[PDB]
């Protein structure tokens, strides 16, 4: 249905952080991105995106909403704190076609650290 993601300087998970960092959703489902902390945004990791999905990037300190219809893995990052490891992951539907790629897509060490972490949450 609807899924709220907080964008945090600091959180229970760590520093520069999407909470929740992983989201299971289904077609039609809505992702509300929410500026709990200023200085963040949410851009698409295009080497983690189902084919047919439009690239996107949000204005800093402001809100954002993505709509999901296409199954698979949607990768997201915060543009200025990408290399600080601030990333998220949304899986829609069973056995995502872009699975291996998520695991293999080249990104900042810290981003990759947390990506694989939200990746082990896939079902
Ligand atoms: Cu950030």
UniProtKB/Swiss-Prot annotation:
Domain of life: Bacteria
Recorded GO CC terms: periplasmic space
Cofactor: how and how many bound: Binds 1 copper ion per subunit.
Required cofactor names: Cu cation
GO terms for MF: copper ion binding; electron transfer activity
Quaternary structure (record): Homodimer.
Binding site for Cu cation: 40, 78, 81, 86
Domain Plastocyanin-like: 5-93
Function per UniProt: This soluble electron transfer copper protein is required for the inactivation of copper-containing nitrite reductase in the presence of oxygen.
Keyword Membrane annotated: no
Organism: Paracoccus pantotrophus
Region span, Disordered: 104-123
The entry's keywords: Copper, Electron transport, Metal-binding, Periplasm, Signal, Transport
Name by which UniProt lists this protein: Pseudoazurin
Compartment list: Periplasm
